[PDB]
Amino acid sequence: MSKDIKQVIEIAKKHNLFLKEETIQFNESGLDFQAVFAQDNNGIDWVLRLPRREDVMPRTKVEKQALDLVNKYAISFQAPNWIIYTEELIAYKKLDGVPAGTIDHNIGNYIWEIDINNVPELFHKSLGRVLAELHSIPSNKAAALDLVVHTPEEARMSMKQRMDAVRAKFGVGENLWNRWQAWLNDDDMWPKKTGLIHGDVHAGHTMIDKDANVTGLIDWTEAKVTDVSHDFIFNYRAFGEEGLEALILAYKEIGGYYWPKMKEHIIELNAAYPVSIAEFALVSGIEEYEQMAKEALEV
Ligand SMILES: CO[C@@H]1[C@@H](O[C@@H]2O[C@H](C)[C@@H](O[C@H]3C[C@@](C)(O)[C@@H](O)[C@H](C)O3)[C@H](N(C)C)[C@H]2O)[C@@H](CC=O)C[C@@H](C)[C@@H](O[C@H]2CC[C@H](N(C)C)[C@@H](C)O2)/C=C/C=C/C[C@@H](C)OC(=O)C[C@H]1O
Ligand SMILES: Nc1nc2c(ncn2[C@@H]2O[C@H](COP(=O)(O)OP(=O)(O)O)[C@@H](O)[C@H]2O)c(=O)[nH]1
Ligand SMILES: [Mg+2]
Ligand SMILES: [Mg+2]
Numbered sequence: 001m002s003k004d005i006k007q008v009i010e011i012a013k014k015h016n017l018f019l020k021e022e023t024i025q026f027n028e029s030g031l032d033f034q035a036v037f038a039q040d041n042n043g044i045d046w047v048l049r050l051p052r053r054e055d056v057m058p059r060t061k062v063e064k065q066a067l068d069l070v071n072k073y074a075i076s077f078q079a080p081n082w083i084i085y086t087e088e089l090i091a092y093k094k095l096d097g098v099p100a101g102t103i104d105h106n107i108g109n110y111i112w113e114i115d116i117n118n119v120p121e122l123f124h125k126s127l128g129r130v131l132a133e134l135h136s137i138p139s140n141k142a143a144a145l146d147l148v149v150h151t152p153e154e155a156r157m158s159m160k161q162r163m164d165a166v167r168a169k170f171g172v173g174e175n176l177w178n179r180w181q182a183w184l185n186d187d188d189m190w191p192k193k194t195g196l197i198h199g200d201v202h203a204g205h206t207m208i209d210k211d212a213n214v215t216g217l218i219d220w221t222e223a224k225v226t227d228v229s230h231d232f233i234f235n236y237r238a239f240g241e242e243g244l245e246a247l248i249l250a251y252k253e254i255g256g257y258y259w260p261k262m263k264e265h266i267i268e269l270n271a272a273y274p275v276s277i278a279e280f281a282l283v284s285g286i287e288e289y290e291q292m293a294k295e296a297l298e299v
Contacts, residue, residue, distance in 0.1 A: 002026075002034040003050055012038070015089050017046060029103040029204055031284070032056045032221070037094065047080070049090040055283050057087050059221050065145040066223030069196070073137045077130045078207070078216035095216040101203035110203055110238075119239060120212040121246070127206065127214050128250025131231050134217075135195035135256060139225045142196050148224035152192050155227040159272070160184055166278040166297065173298025176274070183268040189261040195228050202234040228257060229266045236270050274298075 003011065005024050012019050019038045027035040033056065036048040051057050070079045084091035100123065101110035110116075114123060143149045150158055163180055166172065172180070183189060198205075199222025207216035222230075232251075236244040244263060252258040259265075274296035281289040 002028065002052065008036055008038075008048065008050070011050065011089055012040075012048060015084050015086065015091070017048070017084070017091060018042075019046075027102070028105060030219070031280075032059075033090075045094060046091050047094045049092075051088075053284060055285070059283075060085075060090065062145075062147055062223065063221045065147055066142075066196075066220045069137060069141055069145065069147075070134065070220070070223075073141070074133060076133055077214060079220065080218055095207045095218060097207035097209050097215045099204050099218075100206045100208050100212070100214075103204055112203070113208070114212050119243065123208065123212040123214065124235070124243065124246035125250040126208075126212075127201075127235070128247055128256070129254055130214050130217065131198075131201070131228070131247075132251050132254045132256035134198060135228050135231070137196045139194070139196065142225045147196075148226065150194050150224070150226040152190065152194050152227075155194055156184065156190055158226070159275075162275050162279070163272070166275050166293075169282070170278055170294055170297050171299040172274075176271070176298045179268070180272055183265075183272070189265045189268065191227055191229065191257065191259055191262070191265070193228075193257045194226050195257065196225050197223065197228055197231050199223050199226075199230055201231045203238065227269075229262070229269050232266050233270055233273070236266060237273075241267075 005021060008024060009019055009021060018041045020041060023039040025037045027037065032052060034050040034052060036050065038048060039045045064082065064085060067079055067082065071081050078095045080092040080095070082090055082092045098113055100114050101112040103109070104111045114120060139149060167177065198217055198220060200219055205218045206214055207218070209215050232244060232247055235247045244266060248263055274293065277289065277296045278293035281293040
């Protein structure tokens with residue numbers, strides 16, 4: 001249960017947004033924020049991002065820093081440009097296009113806007129464009145802000161540490177743990193460069209036009225300079241090896257950092273997705289996600 005119309009009106013009013021109530025539309029796809037789309041009495045349309053829990057707004061500090069960087073240096077895609085930003089409300093103008101898919105909590109999966117039964121080649125190609133562009137923003141510009149910046153070995157040690165931490169808290173199935181460790185311990189599989197990543201790339205953030213060309217990305221709380229591989233994970237989860245291959249190919253061809261074992265490395269990172277599920281469980285405190293994490297970790 002989240003905020004209702006009258007509550008949203010009051011939050012918006014406190015922030016000098018005076019909404020036309022009949023235009024208010026709720027979008028509940030986000031685990032961290034309630035989203036509202038609404039037009040104000042000035043005829044101006046808004047996205048209103050309303051935090052669901054105490055842990056949410058503290059994670060937006062880096063987000064704003066990352067958006068400043070991406071809005072300044074990105075040329076071929078849009079990102080939110082926040083107009084209002086307080087501990088109670090973030091607001092910005094809606095990006096062009098529509099999300100390639102959006103989570104429906106009644107089924108626990110996506111309602112797709114693209115033909116999931118035959119994904120357009122332009123979607124992989126253009127996501128490749130967007131990611132290579134993003135990942136090329138100079139790391140020194142991120143270091144001058146409070147963003148996390150990993151060298152390539154720091155990215156590896158960060159993964160080692162995060163795994164150790166989840167094992168200590170939850171346990172980890174022995175076979176899963178051995179798989180993780182064999183990946184960590186295989187020098188040849190790791191990237192030798194890092195870049196600025198989005199960190200939570202998925203269909204629900206990937207804005208597309210009528211041709212399934214990606215034109216924008218929302219939700220930048222996980223941006224940092226680290227292993228670029230994270231931004232390929234959803235393509236593997238949703239579209240399998242073939243979809244991962246298509247995205248890698250496009251990224252490589254347009255100038256993105258590539259190394260010989262990139263695909264295999266990404267697949268291992270996917271096998272380590274339970275680390276991320278566990279971390280969400282701990283950060284959010286949501287009991288169902290603790291259960292999910294234990295299942296995912298094969299405890
Ligand atoms: C986008 O990823 C998605 C993930 O959503 C992400 O889940 C990560 C673990 C979170 O990231 C983590 C790691 C971190 C390092 O980023 C950390 O800083 C951050 C705090 O948390 C991250 N957000 C918080 C950054 C969040 O968007 C889940 C949540 C946990 O997995 C979204 C829930 C609505 C889940 O729907 C649910 C309903 C409830 C249900 N179950 C519990 C009863 C469950 C199984 O599925 C829907 C699942 C759909 C599955 C279909 C496949 C194709 O879809 C994908 O693979 C994408 C998803 O996995
Ligand atoms: N179409 C569209 N949807 C948006 C936009 N901004 C946010 N949303 C929706 O609002 C939801 C929640 O916003 P998000 O920043 O992802 O929140 P979080 O996932 O809870 O951290 C997203 O999943 C989208 O469905 C936008 O600019 N356009
Ligand atoms: Mg989101
Ligand atoms: Mg988020």
